[PDB]
Amino acid sequence: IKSALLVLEDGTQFHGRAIGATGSAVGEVVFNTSMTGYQEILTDPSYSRQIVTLTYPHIGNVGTNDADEESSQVHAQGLVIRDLPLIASNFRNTEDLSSYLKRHNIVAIADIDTRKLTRLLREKGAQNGCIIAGDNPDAALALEKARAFPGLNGMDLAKEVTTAEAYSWTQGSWTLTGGLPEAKKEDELPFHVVAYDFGAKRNILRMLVDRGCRLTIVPAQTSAEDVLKMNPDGIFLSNGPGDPAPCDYAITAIQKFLETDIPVFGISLGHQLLALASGAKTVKMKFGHHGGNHPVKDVEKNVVMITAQNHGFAVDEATLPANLRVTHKSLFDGTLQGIHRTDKPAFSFQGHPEASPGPHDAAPLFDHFIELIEQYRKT
Amino acid sequence: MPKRTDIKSILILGAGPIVIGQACEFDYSGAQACKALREEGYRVILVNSNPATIMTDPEMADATYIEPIHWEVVRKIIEKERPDAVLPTMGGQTALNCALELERQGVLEEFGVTMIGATADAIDKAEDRRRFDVAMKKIGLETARSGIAHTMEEALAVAADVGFPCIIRPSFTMGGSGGGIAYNREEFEEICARGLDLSPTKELLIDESLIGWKEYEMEVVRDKNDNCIIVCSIENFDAMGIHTGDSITVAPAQTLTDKEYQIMRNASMAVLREIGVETGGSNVQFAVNPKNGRLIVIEMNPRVSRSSALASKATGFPIAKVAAKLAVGYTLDELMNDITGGRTPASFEPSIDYVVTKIPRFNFEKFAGANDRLTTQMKSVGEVMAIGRTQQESLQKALRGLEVGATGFDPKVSLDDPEALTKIRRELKDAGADRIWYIADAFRAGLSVDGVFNLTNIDRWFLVQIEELVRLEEKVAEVGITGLNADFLRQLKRKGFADARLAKLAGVREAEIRKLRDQYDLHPVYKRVDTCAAEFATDTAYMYSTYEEECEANPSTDREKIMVLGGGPNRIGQGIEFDYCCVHASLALREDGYETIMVNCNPETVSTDYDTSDRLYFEPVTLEDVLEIVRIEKPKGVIVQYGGQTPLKLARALEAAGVPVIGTSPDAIDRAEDRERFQHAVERLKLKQPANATVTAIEMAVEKAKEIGYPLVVRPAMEIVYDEADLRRYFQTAVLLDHFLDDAVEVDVDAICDGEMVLIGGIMEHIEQAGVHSGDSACSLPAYTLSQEIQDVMRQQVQKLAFELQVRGLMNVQFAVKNNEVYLIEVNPRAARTVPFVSKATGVPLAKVAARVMAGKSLAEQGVTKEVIPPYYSVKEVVLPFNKFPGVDPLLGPEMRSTGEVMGVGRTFAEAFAKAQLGSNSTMKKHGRALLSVREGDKERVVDLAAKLLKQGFELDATHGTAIVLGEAGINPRLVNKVHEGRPHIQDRIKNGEYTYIINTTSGRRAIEDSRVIRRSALQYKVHYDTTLNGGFATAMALNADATEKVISVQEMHAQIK
Ligand SMILES: Nc1ncnc2c1ncn2[C@@H]1O[C@H](COP(=O)(O)OP(=O)(O)O)[C@@H](O)[C@H]1O
Ligand SMILES: Nc1ncnc2c1ncn2[C@@H]1O[C@H](COP(=O)(O)OP(=O)(O)O)[C@@H](O)[C@H]1O
Ligand SMILES: CC[N+](CC)(CC)CC
Ligand SMILES: NCCC[C@H](N)C(=O)O
Ligand SMILES: [Cl-]
Ligand SMILES: [Cl-]
Ligand SMILES: [Cl-]
Ligand SMILES: [Cl-]
Ligand SMILES: [K+]
Ligand SMILES: [K+]
Ligand SMILES: [K+]
Ligand SMILES: [K+]
Ligand SMILES: [K+]
Ligand SMILES: [K+]
Ligand SMILES: [K+]
Ligand SMILES: [K+]
Ligand SMILES: [Mn+2]
Ligand SMILES: [Mn+2]
Ligand SMILES: [Mn+2]
């Protein structure tokens, strides 16, 4: 018996078993509905400071592998599951989940009523929590830490996960037959996109590259100036953790780029930053959107796409400046999903066109970007 | 775009009688569609020869046609109701096939009927295997190496190329009908001959083997706006090589990485797009090589299916309802999600927080000479479904819900058996129905997970779990009841262990384990199905039990409640009939204001549709599971008489545990069920019954027998012994003893008793004599040969029995009329399988009435007090599964083997029988040559049947003795050689298509075994045959009618009722 315990800000306790590292974990507790994709989830920087709860009971069926990592490390503060399978059973597995958690030093708990947990978050909204995995988990202690948690509202996490120094990326997408392909030669990529690293998932880069983009990844706080100097064919605003609002630097730079004719495209966080930079307002959702089955309607074309979502904040639709046009809304809740500048070649999407994990339905969002780029170069 | 307005009326093609591979799922679907289209304001017309379906209930549609599902007949309905459109995707293969025939025949063109849901081309694209194959290569999807064949020669060449073993799959068939796996040339020719003949398009697809690869399915829904969703993914437990229908399956998929799952999800959408399904759902099947994720597309079914039903129950997403709507122009974004309170749209992919497991139900014990190994052709007769928070919990609950007597992983071989590993091994390597239990035996015997893997190809992910459960069992056995502390017990419960399984392991009574749980306050909690993994709230109470923290039951204190116990999985003898009853009890009581709670776990039924009741517990129908429900619901009453044997057997224990059982008492039930108790009652009643006697020993039997007199009905199975020597003979192979009433009419009587009066629901006279099970006999309502005088006697005896036995609700009484005397065969104090047919024939909803009676409202209070005698004839005929097990002698007897039935409505008996015969898929013709080969005792009446055939234009052949008898009466048939007599003989004559009709009656074990080749060939070569003289006469009468001449709707039929 290796005990683990999870306690929420509200006093609610979940007694289970330790499946990862010994220790404690404090963060915002979220629930994620994805039936497949747990590794990609965990490796998503957007999960920084969040304890992730998966609604699908069996987590770890396929083990883990390096191609399924969305970044260089495990970003989740902790993991909460109903059941860890006895074995991993997939030809692609390189290490069982538990071993993987131990290695990444992740505090994880299994064997708890995740549905209860989920219903609580839904009904009563996100809550901060603490997971304690060890010999005698002190519940009063857990309760303490949870309570002491600051909270993600107004918390800028982008700065914490951003790359120290710039760098180049020219690698494309994995294939069944070829796996993760070798990085391309710069000469092989037609365009040059400069990407703000607010905690970017590797698949975004991979997919842009697939589209002919050579990339330069920059720290979250890179200056527009320093950026404009590179002569980018396009500017990409990555996804990332925490409150987008406290990111004055980015908002400021973004505003600088908008005075220009350079194509701009943001995903999730970058979508909110764009919105802010355009004068919109962002809010923190009751519990957010985390899952891969979320219906999103493209209002112009009147079609629905099933998407991957990972967001705790949203852009208010009622506060939209006239220069921002609404391109997509959630079918689950009508919340704002996409916007396009009516005057500038700038647009964004709240969900994840790059999925990873999830439905490929929204991939085409990228395409528009390319188009913009191609046409920006025609000048 | 919203609903279609260029359409007002819609014809829905129902599926027909239940058969292996095409079951209840279609009534669930048909009913969903009816409902959906009805709510949309369309006029609904439907055709279904199967009377035991909710979809044929008059109040479900506008024009209900219970007529043979033949294009000529359907044309008559069309021409007659002039529907604007036709929805052919809700009736299995029968609907697809009919749709295309109506199309082929110009019928649709003729009356301007628009095909909705799926187009004829769409259908053909998926149904024609060649077309399908071309379509996949065109979208860059991989298919097994294969070849198309339209003749044997072609076939052989494809084989020469793919090699053995190879997979044979007919075009235009499903459920593996006409297919199989050929491991050799011999098997190859047989299967091939079989499918070319069965294929509606005389075409086969022959593939190389992918046996052992992983098998996957995906349920897809697509709208005209091109919106597309995956409603559910299924991972099969049994590998490629064993039909999905006969496989243990689970949802959602378990062993695919997200990357592999997207590729498959993408492929699935591509396929519908390429095939052309634009407004509806479809099933797409795949094969995955576990070693490298290599994906292969296997097939696609352009309609709802058995999987779509499972899928709808698994997720809470009503696929068929949605589909019907889409078929009328609606788009997904426009429909609301039912279970989420309409809060979200139907355009989303469900996510579930539990594991769903389905286990097929077989009936091999009813088909002795049959090959009982699982293959690509379905052999299962039903299926159970279970929901659990974990796979182990899910699996185990399903095992206990299967109604095979298992309590979970009960052992099949003894630990001390020296040959155990060898038996285990074979069972593993060559799957049969019991494979699952053998897997657990293997672990007890010392086989490793890798060892088991190697033989079964079942993914280790599942195997390790079973192994872990075995190890848990060993601990239980070791620590005994003493070791059953709270923690351990909780642990065991969380893993799905039944109190019964634990009791056996700890060598105590089940009640002891239960009690212990009570002590520890160890009870399950209930979770609800919601399509979204708790992301949104639900206003529906579709629940399942699990051992966890939070309970979502929130039972009302408001309403008086009534619990209806279902029958679990369908099996031969326990079909949809019993479910139709459960449904009607629920609908009626709810309408009456009670809060209705349904307890069932059959994924194919309307009873397990959340719409059917106020609250649904999708649980195994067991004492353990029921008591837990009761424990928290505290209902006013519980109905155990409507679900078949399953709930019937729990009756006593339920009451004993203080459950409030309504209707006929558990004691009363036993009085009727216990032969002895029954014999006294009869006696006390001064009623006639065959002479009988329990014989212990052999010799005690040969003497008693003398007493009783031959022939004898040896019920321990069932057999008819004709002579002393037969007795010992049987005994050798082999106790109640009963004089077999030879040359008797069998009669069934359905009735209701309210304690005050008895209402005769219907007197049905069987066509086949006593001795051929009633479940396998065609029958007529009203009787077609019984005198009123004698029926009046039966009516009086039913009443005498009703009052004496204390019946309260339904009852069914069976007689044998011999020499103007009534004899009693048995009393079934509960809803019988004839209840739907009678209700349909008479317009009276017996199950609705009897359910009200049981709940407390008298027959007088309801205004249902007089027996109804329709102005037309109602004939019920059955469908038998022999074609699925060609090694079995296709003859009728005292044991039931039929899977379903159809109803025929006529102005006359001949007319009803003709429509019933046709509806049953009879290949009977009105010309040709008939072969007569009858038993001694029939030789006399044969003459007349022979005259009849003659006057009809038939030519005749006959075997020796029969010919001798005809000649003497002036009839000279053409003599035919018996197989041993020389050549040519009947087999040759049959094989060479010389006959269009066969009448062959036999008597005696030896004589039967000998004549086996006639029946077998007849069935093989598709020649209509009767195995009873009584049946021959009936067939003869129908020769005089025309089943396509006139059609009538249920509403019209019921209006004619005065
Ligand atoms: N190439 C193959 N090798 C082995 N088994 C196969 C192959 N193709 C199909 N099967 C098996 O046969 C079953 C029936 O084939 P399917 O195409 O689905 O026919 P049906 O339409 O009658 O259901 C599949 O569920 C699968 O287990
Ligand atoms: N004494 C008998 N004489 C003739 N036929 C009989 C006799 N007893 C039973 N049968 C035949 O056997 C069938 C099954 O017997 P029954 O007692 O009703 O068994 P079950 O419980 O399976 O319904 C009947 O429907 C009937 O054809
Ligand atoms: C499976 C249903 N049938 C073919 C579609 C065979 C009995 C009806 C004729
Ligand atoms: N009602 C039973 C089916 C009849 C079949 N033709 C037979 O006579 O054997
Ligand atoms: Cl818990
Ligand atoms: Cl078929
Ligand atoms: Cl391969
Ligand atoms: Cl067989
Ligand atoms: K726990
Ligand atoms: K029309
Ligand atoms: K098909
Ligand atoms: K191929
Ligand atoms: K299978
Ligand atoms: K299938
Ligand atoms: K009979
Ligand atoms: K019976
Ligand atoms: Mn099929
Ligand atoms: Mn199939
Ligand atoms: Mn009977």
Chain B residues with CB-CB distance to A32 below 8 A? none
Which tokens go with B641? 């008489």
Residue B951: C-alpha distances to residues A371, B238, B1040 (Å): 83, 56, 11
Report the C-alpha gap between A360 and B230 in whole angstroms.
Answer: 13
Q: Any idea which residue has 């509403």 for tokens?
A: B1051
One domain for residues B953 and B1006: yes
Residue B1029: C-alpha distances to residues B28, B98, B744, B934, B999 (Å): 38, 33, 12, 8, 8
One domain for residues B376 and B246: yes
* Contact (Cβ atoms closer than 8 angstroms) between residue A84 and residue A56: no
Of B553, B571, B598, the last residue of a domain is: B553
Report the C-alpha gap between B324 and B29 in whole angstroms.
Answer: 10
Chain A residues with CB-CB distance to B253 below 8 A? 35-36
> From B548, which residue of chain A is nearest by alpha-carbon distance?
A113
Please, which residues bridge with residue A16 across strands? Answer: A4
Which tokens go with B138? 């065109």
> From B467, which residue of chain A is nearest by alpha-carbon distance?
A86
Distance of residue A113 Cα from the nearest chain B Cα, in angstroms: 6
- What is the number of the ligand 4 atom nearest to the C-alpha of B898? 2
CA quadruple A343, A346, A352, A356: dihedral positive or negative?
positive
Which tokens go with A237? 């605003």
Chain B residues with CB-CB distance to A62 below 8 A? 255-257
> From A291, which residue of chain B is nearest by alpha-carbon distance?
B351
Nearest CA to ligand 4 atom 8: B1026
* Contact (Cβ atoms closer than 8 angstroms) between residue B971 and residue B950: yes
CA of B567 to the centre of ligand 9 (A): 34
Distance of residue A235 Cα from the nearest chain B Cα, in angstroms: 28
Sheet holding B382-388, edge to edge: B295-301, B280-288, B214-222, B228-236, B249-251, B355-361, B382-388
**Is there an atom of ligand 2 within 6 Å of B894 CB?**
yes
Count up the domains in chain B and report the number. Answer: 8
Which secondary-structure segment (H or E) carries B206?
strand B204-208
CA B998-B1000-B1003 angle, 5° bins: 170
Q: Radius of gyration (Cα) for chain B, nearest Å?
A: 28
Report the C-alpha gap between B276 and B124 in whole angstroms.
Answer: 10
Distance of residue B341 Cα from the nearest chain A Cα, in angstroms: 13
The 8-class DSSP code of residue A185 comes to P
Q: Determine contact: A376 vs chain B, CB below 8 A.
A: no
Which of A375, A371, A261, A281 is CA-nearest to residue A324? A281
Report the C-alpha gap between A174 and A183 in whole angstroms.
Answer: 11
* Contact (Cβ atoms closer than 8 angstroms) between residue B1017 and residue B986: yes
One domain for residues B598 and B543: no
* Helices and strands of chain A, counted as H and E runs: 10, 17
Which of B774, B756, B758 is CA-nearest to residue B766? B774
**Helix ranges, B1021-1049 (H):** 1029-1038
Q: Does B258 sit within 8 Å of A357, measured CB to CB?
A: yes
Report the C-alpha gap between B645 and A234 in whole angstroms.
Answer: 72
One domain for residues B483 and B607: no
| Contact residues for B344 (Cβ-Cβ < 8 A; gap 6+) | A295, A331, A332, B336, B337, B532, B536
Q: Any idea which residue has 């299994």 for tokens?
A: A110
CA quadruple B102, B108, B111, B117: dihedral positive or negative?
positive
Report the C-alpha gap between B761 and B782 in whole angstroms.
Answer: 11
CATH number for A151-379 (one of 2.40.30.40, 1.10.8.100, 3.40.50.880, 3.90.209.20): it is 3.40.50.880
Portion 532-561 of B in contact with A at CB < 8 A = 532-537, 548-550
CATH code, B365: 3.30.470.20
Sheet holding B43-47, edge to edge: B63-65, B43-47, B9-13, B85-87, B114-115
Report the C-alpha gap between B877 and B98 in whole angstroms.
Answer: 21
Of A40, A122, A293, the CB nearest to B534: A122
DSSP string, B652-720: HHHHHTT--B-SS-HHHHHHHHSHHHHHHHHHHHT-----B----SHHHHHHHHHHH-SSEE------E
Nearest CA to ligand 2 atom 11: B771
Which secondary-structure segment (H or E) carries A109?
strand A107-110
Residue B35: C-alpha distances to residues B9, B56, B130, B326, B695 (Å): 14, 12, 36, 14, 55
One domain for residues B129 and B193: no
* Contact (Cβ atoms closer than 8 angstroms) between residue B752 and residue B793: no
CATH number for A1-150 (one of 3.30.70.20, 3.50.30.20, 3.40.50.2300, 1.10.1780.10): it is 3.50.30.20
Give the start-to-end residue ranges of the domains of chain A.
Answer: 1-150, 151-379
Name the residue range of residue B729's domain: 687-741
Which of B834, B861, B881, B1039 is CA-nearest to residue B947? B1039
* Contact (Cβ atoms closer than 8 angstroms) between residue B749 and residue B812: yes
Q: Determine contact: B465 vs chain A, CB below 8 A.
A: yes
Q: Does B262 sit within 8 Å of A358, measured CB to CB?
A: yes
Say how many Å lie between the first and final Cα of chain B, rounded. Answer: 47
Which of B298, B309, B308, B314 is CA-nearest to residue B251? B314
Which residues of B make up each annotated binding site for Mn(2+)? Answer: 285, 299, 301, 814, 826, 828
* Helices and strands of chain B, counted as H and E runs: 38, 36
Of B254, B257, B344, the CB nearest to A332: B344
**Is there an atom of ligand 3 within 6 Å of B22 CB?**
yes
Q: What amino acid is encoded at B368 in this protein?
A: A
CA A219-A220-A223 angle, 5° bins: 85
Q: Determine contact: A291 vs chain B, CB below 8 A.
A: yes
Report the C-alpha gap between B218 and B531 in whole angstroms.
Answer: 16
**Is there an atom of ligand 4 within 6 Å of B1002 CB?**
no
Which of A1, A21, A23, A8 is CA-nearest to residue A113? A8
For chain A, percent helix, then strand, then coil, each to nearest 5?
25, 30, 45
Of B492, B526, B553, the last residue of a domain is: B553
Which of A225, A228, A189 is CA-nearest to residue A208? A189
CA of B142 to the centre of ligand 13 (A): 19
CA B522-B526-B532 angle, 5° bins: 145
Which of B798, B768, B763 is CA-nearest to residue B782? B763
Ligand 1, residues B199, B298, B303, B884: which to mutate, most atoms within 8 A of Cβ? Answer: B298
Q: Is B824 helix (H, G, I), strand (E, B) or coil?
A: strand
CATH code, B517: 1.10.1030.10
Report the C-alpha gap between A142 and A152 in whole angstroms.
Answer: 18
The full length of chain A comes to: 379
Which of B564, B540, B547 is CA-nearest to residue B663? B564
Report the C-alpha gap between A239 and A269 in whole angstroms.
Answer: 5
Q: Does B292 sit within 8 Å of A91, measured CB to CB?
A: yes
Which of B59, B35, B15 is CA-nearest to residue B584? B59
Q: Is B482 helix (H, G, I), strand (E, B) or coil?
A: helix
CA B358-B360-B362 angle, 5° bins: 165
Which secondary-structure segment (H or E) carries A293?
strand A282-298
| Contact residues for B683 (Cβ-Cβ < 8 A; gap 6+) | none
One domain for residues B953 and B991: yes
Residue of A31, A36, A95 to mutate when probing chain B, most B C-beta within 10 A: A36
Which residues of B make up each annotated binding site? Answer: 129, 169, 175-176, 208, 210, 215, 241-243, 285, 299, 301, 715, 739, 741, 746, 771-774, 814, 826, 828
One domain for residues B481 and B548: yes
How many Cα atoms are found within 13 Å in the side-chain-facing hemisphere of B1051? 11
Say how many Å lie between the first and final Cα of chain A, rounded. Answer: 67
Check for a shared fold between A1-150 and A151-379.
Answer: no
CATH code, B32: 3.40.50.20
- What is the number of the ligand 2 atom nearest to the C-alpha of B814? 18
Which tokens go with B999? 């009448």
Burial pattern A120-153, b for ≥16 Cβ within 10 A else e, equals: bbbeeebbbbbbbbbeebebeebbebbbebeebe
Q: Is the peptide bond before B711 cis (omega within 30 degrees of 0)?
A: yes
Report the C-alpha gap between B895 and B923 in whole angstroms.
Answer: 24
Of B157, B192, B210, the last residue of a domain is: B210
Experiment used for this model: X-ray
Report the C-alpha gap between B1009 and B990 in whole angstroms.
Answer: 18
One domain for residues B393 and B425: no
Q: Does A295 sit within 8 Å of B255, measured CB to CB?
A: no
How many Cα atoms are found within 13 Å in the side-chain-facing hemisphere of B910? 9
Name all contacts of A172-177 with Cβ < 8 Å and 24+ positions apart: A172/A206, A172/A209, A172/A210, A173/A203, A173/A206, A173/A207, A173/A209, A173/A210, A174/A67, A174/A206, A174/B259, A176/B259, A176/B260, A176/B263, A176/B293
Residue B465: C-alpha distances to residues A61, B469, B472, B979 (Å): 12, 6, 11, 55
* Contact (Cβ atoms closer than 8 angstroms) between residue B313 and residue B25: no
Nearest CA to ligand 4 atom 5: B1026
One domain for residues B969 and B863: no
Q: Determine contact: A295 vs chain B, CB below 8 A.
A: yes
Q: Is B580 helix (H, G, I), strand (E, B) or coil?
A: helix
**Is there an atom of ligand 3 within 6 Å of B921 CB?**
yes
Of A35, A85, A113, the CB nearest to B351: A35
Report the C-alpha gap between B976 and B996 in whole angstroms.
Answer: 15
Please name which ligand lies nearest the alpha carbon of B550: 5
CA of B830 to the centre of ligand 16 (A): 10
CA of B132 to the centre of ligand 7 (A): 22
Of A37, A58, A331, the CB nearest to B348: A331
Nearest CA to ligand 3 atom 5: B94
Which tokens go with B92? 């299995």
CA of B826 to the centre of ligand 16 (A): 7
**Helix ranges, B858-908 (H):** 859-862
Report the C-alpha gap between B277 and B1046 in whole angstroms.
Answer: 35
CATH code, B188: 3.30.1490.20
Which residues in chain B are followed by a discontinuity, with C-to-N distance exceeding 2.5 angstroms? 716, 734
Please, which residues bridge with residue B985 across strands? Answer: B977
The 8-class DSSP code of residue B721 comes to E
Q: What amino acid is encoded at A184 in this protein?
A: K
One domain for residues B773 and B884: yes
Report the C-alpha gap between B524 and B547 in whole angstroms.
Answer: 4
One domain for residues B676 and B770: yes
Q: Is A97 helix (H, G, I), strand (E, B) or coil?
A: helix
Which of A10, A71, A19, A29 is CA-nearest to residue A356? A71
Of B229, B252, B532, the CB nearest to A306: B229
Chain B residues with CB-CB distance to A114 below 8 A? 353
Which tokens go with B1012? 């086996």
- Would you tell me the crossing angle of helices B435-445 and B449-456 to the nearest 10 degrees? 150
Write a three-state SS string for A123-171. Answer: HHCCEEEEEEECCCCCHHHHHHHHHHCCCCCCCECHHHHCCCCCEEECC
One domain for residues B616 and B692: no
* Contact (Cβ atoms closer than 8 angstroms) between residue B206 and residue B146: yes
Which of A362, A352, A303 is CA-nearest to residue B227? A303
Q: Does A87 sit within 8 Å of B258, measured CB to CB?
A: no
* Contact (Cβ atoms closer than 8 angstroms) between residue B844 and residue B761: yes
Which of A131, A74, A129, A84 is CA-nearest to residue A110? A84
